[PDB]
Design a protein around this ligand. Sequence first.
Ligand SMILES: Nc1ncnc2c1ncn2[C@@H]1O[C@H](COP(=O)(O)OP(=O)(O)O)[C@@H](O)[C@H]1O
Ligand SMILES: Nc1ncnc2c1ncn2[C@@H]1O[C@H](COP(=O)(O)OP(=O)(O)O)[C@@H](O)[C@H]1O
Ligand SMILES: Nc1ncnc2c1ncn2[C@@H]1O[C@H](COP(=O)(O)OP(=O)(O)O)[C@@H](O)[C@H]1O
Ligand SMILES: Nc1ncnc2c1ncn2[C@@H]1O[C@H](COP(=O)(O)OP(=O)(O)O)[C@@H](O)[C@H]1O
Lengths: 382, 351, 382, 351
Amino acid sequence: DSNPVRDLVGVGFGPSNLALAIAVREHNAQVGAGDQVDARFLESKPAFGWHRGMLIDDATMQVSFLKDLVTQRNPASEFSFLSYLHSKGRLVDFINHKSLFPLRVEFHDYFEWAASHLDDSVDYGVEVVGVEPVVRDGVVEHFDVVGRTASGQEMTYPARNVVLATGLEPNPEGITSGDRVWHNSELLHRIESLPDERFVVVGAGQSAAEVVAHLHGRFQDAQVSAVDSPFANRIFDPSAVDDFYTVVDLDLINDLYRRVYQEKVLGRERLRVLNTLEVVETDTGVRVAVEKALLESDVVVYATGYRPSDPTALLGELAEHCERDDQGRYRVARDYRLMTGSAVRGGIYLQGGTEHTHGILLSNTAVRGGEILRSIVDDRGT
Amino acid sequence: SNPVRDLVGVGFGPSNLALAIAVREHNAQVGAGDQVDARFLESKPAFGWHRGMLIDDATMQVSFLKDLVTQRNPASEFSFLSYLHSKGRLVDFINHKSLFPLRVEFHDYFEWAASHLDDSVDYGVEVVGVEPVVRDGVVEHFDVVGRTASGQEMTYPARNVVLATGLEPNLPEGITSGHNSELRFVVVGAGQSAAEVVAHLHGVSAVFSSDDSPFANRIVDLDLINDLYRRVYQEKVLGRERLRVLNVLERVAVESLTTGEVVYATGYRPSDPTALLGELAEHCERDDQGRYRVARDYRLMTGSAVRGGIYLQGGTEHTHGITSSLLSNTAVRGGEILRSIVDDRGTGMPR
Amino acid sequence: DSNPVRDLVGVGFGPSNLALAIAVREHNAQVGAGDQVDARFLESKPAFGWHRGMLIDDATMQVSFLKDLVTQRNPASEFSFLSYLHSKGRLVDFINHKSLFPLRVEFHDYFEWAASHLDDSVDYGVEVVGVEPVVRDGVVEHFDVVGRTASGQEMTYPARNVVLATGLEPNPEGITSGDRVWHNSELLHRIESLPDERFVVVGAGQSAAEVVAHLHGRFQDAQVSAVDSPFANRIFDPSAVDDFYTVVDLDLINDLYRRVYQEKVLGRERLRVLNTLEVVETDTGVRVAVEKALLESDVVVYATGYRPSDPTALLGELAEHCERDDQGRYRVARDYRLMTGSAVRGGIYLQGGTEHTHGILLSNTAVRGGEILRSIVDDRGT
Amino acid sequence: SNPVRDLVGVGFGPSNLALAIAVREHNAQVGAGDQVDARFLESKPAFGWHRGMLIDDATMQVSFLKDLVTQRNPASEFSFLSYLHSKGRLVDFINHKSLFPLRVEFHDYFEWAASHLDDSVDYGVEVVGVEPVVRDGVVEHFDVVGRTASGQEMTYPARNVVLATGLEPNLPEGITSGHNSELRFVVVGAGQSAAEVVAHLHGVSAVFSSDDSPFANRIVDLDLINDLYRRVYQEKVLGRERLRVLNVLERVAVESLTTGEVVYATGYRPSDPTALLGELAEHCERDDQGRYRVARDYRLMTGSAVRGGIYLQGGTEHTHGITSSLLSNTAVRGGEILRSIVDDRGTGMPR
Ligand SMILES: Nc1ncnc2c1ncn2[C@@H]1O[C@H](COP(=O)(O)OP(=O)(O)O)[C@@H](O)[C@H]1O
Ligand SMILES: Nc1ncnc2c1ncn2[C@@H]1O[C@H](COP(=O)(O)OP(=O)(O)O)[C@@H](O)[C@H]1O
Ligand SMILES: Nc1ncnc2c1ncn2[C@@H]1O[C@H](COP(=O)(O)OP(=O)(O)O)[C@@H](O)[C@H]1O
Ligand SMILES: Nc1ncnc2c1ncn2[C@@H]1O[C@H](COP(=O)(O)OP(=O)(O)O)[C@@H](O)[C@H]1O
């Protein structure tokens, strides 16, 4: 009987579920030994690690440090970004720097430092193979979260609740990937594996923008062929969609068309912007067409963003029990609970993919996490 | 009387409130034996950084991060961010993607912090002097002497005393009124960021006055710079807007330099503590002009006669910048002063 | 026989036809007394005058001085904006000011100064009442442009060619205007005629943006209720649509949502942004509804831009002879000639409304004008 | 020999080309009697502001409007805008919504203008001196003396002579090589906009060194300022990029101040004309240090002995700014010099 049932088991340990893990810690401090919340998180990766694909070593963050794992839920937290700076002695230098936006690498080390303090909360290298329901009076009292190590042994994690923050996955029509057709996230692990070349960047958003620039880079004498404030007050009021349920960068804008202009002016165009079918990759690149030009090159990157993992497999039996919309997409409650019915007594909660897609995110990770934890504690008693 | 306190502080504006906040976060973490007993005495009957309690609706040129507490402890319940959270404006502000809040928000934040720390302060008390408590020509502690609005006198034993009485307008020979804050065919004033007053004056005739980036804020507003150069440029054909703004001698006008056409304007300097010191003023080291020297721990430099400390939290230089006493080190200096007091409290004294 | 036939008669004398008038002058200088182009322009207004509706006295121009009447066709012209500065002694102060964008008022005086030198080229207060064709062998050799003074007398202007730059007109569904329902252009002539109030600004673009701000303004303690680089390289190459024929301001963005934010923060909201039928104007404002809220106020402004004058009336008989698209909209040649057929021997050319709408313009006034004039001179001989 | 020309000019870089352009636009407007006969003599065999003829692909920090001609006559066929029109790049540039062209475009523009004015210039001619042509101790005009690459000498009568030989690197006691333009474990240099060289150095160890807005450009690049402060800030943990950039004594290193670890870098100064003047140098007024005084019309101040003028177009101060001799007044000063020459050509002489 080494596995009694936990209050919560979370699947995945990226930021989203780390943010939650933090609130479980801060909650346990305020409450006594009788109201502790017992949370375990399971990460398939052997160690904590956000995205390896966009580590452009001197990019600044598109988002303000205030959107860290914790602050929008609790601004007095030992695990805010400012708090991490204080422990590495950089708070003053950062406060003086008079910016909202640090480098993408400080957030990575911040994530690593948060994930490090909360290391007891997680088993890494454990891949969840299913959430199977534990039934009594035709009621699912709790779940056996089943996990597999990298050496094959299977484990059981009883939990009244399950939280899904498995992260997301590359994407609408194009459904293939070889040795010469990459996704925007593959660019670093592959640039470091190709060594005058030719590229093509289908895409949208800053994702596709960032490749056209680095394909230039301190790098290529070759060809590369491309194919803030609106949400500062579209957020507006702290009310959101509770009255109704009752992708550009000005600096990169100019930097790239500058390159095209200056290259038009001086003739030596490393760049070629394009505006407006099948692909036939042989060994000499690819024979993909556009409405018509069966353009060919060496490699062809994209940027149609990311999408949340589909949980049906993981749900197994329970997938059937979940309310759907008119398309069979999963409905989601206001407290981020999958809609299962009174048949199912515990909850299955969602961070991550909830509604949206396409964003290389953290917009509300902190507050959603705490709202979930309070939903879990409320359901445990008055 | 009282038992001797770890520190008695003079004044309760922003500077001393930061210290008070720092005193509290200390007393929580440490046991009941390492508690610091700090009292603050404020002459005004209520807290008010601005006694005019009716200021602007511009943004602050300083990032909210220079609040009473953050730069010493970013995990504090009394950060500006905490204050927003308590008003449910924390989300709106994060979305607003700014470093610089409105002038009124910081005022309200000061007021909100000063309310949480009401127990550490007595208002309506004007400290009139520190007479040294001596045995053997040695000052063991201080009697901070204060008088209410009714004349009654009270005494406060303290091993340490902290001065954060704030500052004073800087005026040379001429002083009149009929300063930069007091706001017709002629008035007067001047300043280096008086330009920041000059800008809004648009919309009557008045009279007033690189290698700068390394390591950042470790040392004028570019936007008002530009608005002013815009305004003067756009003002080809037509002179000054609604007034006649222009930038030395004395129904009264003043002449100025070789040829020249009663409120004032200038900068700031800290209150002189000599009066408050009385006897002890002479125990204090001075520079080659007799000005008060100040240690690294912000202690007045008093002889070995004096065993406790006299500290300065209220900023001690000629700042020339209102609402910038924060961009200094109020938070961190406060904590540094606080740490100085707990240290001299345990040493068995080896010189 | 006091009216022989002119090479060109132009209808209207705003910028578009003034730009053309200038090229007729510069052309006449280069050529001898035998190849002179005889151009007359007719303006209904009694004097030259662009838009009276957007004279916000310290706005800067949205467009660079290089887009003046002349420069993109001839950068060495005595009637560029820089040239006008030189004659008022402001060239150095302007050159030193190190900006591309002067105030909207300097362009107005520049327009007035250009229109002043070219004053011989125009009769003002003459309203064109029709372009009627002059026929011989079933061929229209030239046109009688017919014009009426403000005192009723009618005049005839024979011209081998006619150029239409009548300007544009307010606009999609809403087709009415009273004493309490304005267009974006009426705001000044009406703000200066109203004297806590209430407004409503339907609209789009910077047009509607500019009213929400001034309705605040150094003015109203009242309510106001709202309802660059992309074309720097979308222009790209100097090739345009000859391979294929073979609305925001960052400063105003922030300035307005700043107002809404600061007003949310401090409670005293003079502003109310809105996001997502019939109107029933009685004497107490108007009873217009939105999908539902039959909102009422004092006045309701719009900003659905402008559209070109429809020339069918002016064409009279000739309107029938003009090629149409699949909707009956007028087709337009590459040289800006209405498509009439070999029946019609002279041309009828178009500045202004050509294809687009919605813009409170000058983008190509200079080059289009010269292209038209050369089309007219080419058609006059080898 | 020649008949006496209105002006003979020394050198044919940017400064003197502006004048040459101004001389031409004059000769068009005026009749055949008021034509100005100007010759220019350039030592180099071909025009080249930069003799290295292989410069950068950055933008210019100066607006194209400071071209050879515009600020004197914005209606000129030899504006930068005209040059673009002639290459069909005028539309692309207007759409590009910039004031600042690429460094190569202005170079090519200079070359294009210098080609149109080939008739006004003789290349391969090194002017060696101005010997005064006297009758009655009075200098009526000048013999500009020049020698080709083959030693042959030629003479040029001119009522006026214009000096625009350009400038010189400024170096104190130490001069070596093994300057700011010439571009290992130690080199050397310095400057105020040497920072502009320091910036691109990123991507080996080297060694180098408000009330500013009224009325605008009537008096460092903020963007490179920021890139550098970014670079140093971002460089916490890791030192200098690819090198070891740092900012006085002499396989060779130099020590510097109290403690310190062969190309150079500094600013600029104009060529000294004393040699070229010879005899006449003494006819020229000087300041309290013997330096050449210069009139409002840019004339060397020579006595009433000398009836014609000697003018300076080649910028006469210590500029400290390459590619900024335009932000001066080349266009307008050129025209001002030209007007000075036509005026002294008609006066019946009343003093
Ligand atoms: N079935 C699974 N079992 C365990 N871990 C998983 C499973 N599916 C995905 N993961 C892990 O979930 C994590 C999600 O992290 P990430 O994608 O960075 O986004 P988030 O910030 O939303 O957590 C990844 O580390 C991924 O390896
Ligand atoms: N002798 C005194 N006794 C008590 N309080 C005093 C005395 N002199 C000044 N004060 C008070 O000290 C406070 C200093 O506040 P302020 O000038 O805002 O300081 P800070 O630099 O901390 O912002 C004021 O409220 C003032 O009334
Ligand atoms: N039938 C007409 N006869 C004469 N003038 C006209 C007629 N219709 C319009 N106009 C005039 O044409 C001019 C167009 O000017 P404007 O609208 O400023 O734009 P543009 O810059 O395109 O010329 C206006 O002055 C208007 O009064
Ligand atoms: N004694 C001389 N005779 C003829 N030409 C000379 C003499 N000395 C210098 N020059 C030439 O004068 C020109 C000055 O050009 P530059 O330095 O570019 O001047 P600017 O300040 O006009 O840009 C150079 O081409 C240089 O070769």
